[PDB]
């Protein structure tokens, strides 16, 4: 699709068999989602946003569908205001910015 | 242009006579720039994200040049860690996300 930006670019994602809403975020290096159960081990990560840096859990090689496109990659879990799809998965689904 | 997302989508902007680097950020509702002077009236605002909230000054009807493209709209000014061009001005330059 071609998504304009008059509204927030919210899509449906599927992770762990669950549908969730997430924001496509070109300003996010990383994908971060609200607290949920993911398989496997995690590693610690600090991520920086507008208000400062916070600790999240990093799970690697997680299967995730984004707007119907499949991806397998790193998902961070932590106290984010919204589910965010960042550049690490936007690249896998072939997203670009155009103007 | 078509901008891939392998690295941060940074562009040059001109605002208030000044050249700055800024992030094209589909996850940002509005544009927020590091501390600088702008002409006219302003009012305080809080904006929030990962890590919490910051206080900014809201200036309306400000012209920016974004990668060569002029727009006008609200610009927030405050202690953001990165200059961000948000949706309020991305729409005006016709930016879309494509995949
Ligand atoms: C969190 C989203 C919903 C909103 N933010 C935009 C995001 O793109 C934000 C931009 C940014 C990049 C680098 C450092 C600081 C900020 N990236 C972000 O936090 O990256 C994290 C999440 C995972 O990857 C790392 S905002 O900055 O809080 C914000 C809020 C309101 C307005 N009007 C403008 C901006
Ligand atoms: Cl949800
Ligand atoms: Cl869960
Ligand atoms: Cl969708
Ligand atoms: Cl990844
Ligand atoms: Cl503050
Ligand atoms: Cl505006
Ligand atoms: Cl349009
Ligand atoms: Na868990
Ligand atoms: Na894993
Ligand atoms: Na004004």
From Swiss-Prot, chains A, B:
Stretches for region Dimerization of protease: 1-5, 49-55, 88-99
Active-site residue list: 25 (for protease activity)
Domain Peptidase A2: 20-89
Role, per record: Aspartyl protease that mediates proteolytic cleavages of Gag and Gag-Pol polyproteins during or shortly after the release of the virion from the plasma membrane. Cleavages take place as an ordered, step-wise cascade to yield mature proteins. This process is called maturation. Displays maximal activity during the budding process just prior to particle release from the cell. Also cleaves Nef and Vif, probably concomitantly with viral structural proteins on maturation of virus particles. Hydrolyzes host EIF4GI and PABP1 in order to shut off the capped cellular mRNA translation.
Subunit composition and interactions: Homodimer, whose active site consists of two apposed aspartic acid residues.
Protein name: Protease
Species annotation: Human immunodeficiency virus type 1 group M subtype B (isolate BH10)
Included range, full protein: 501 to 599 of 1447
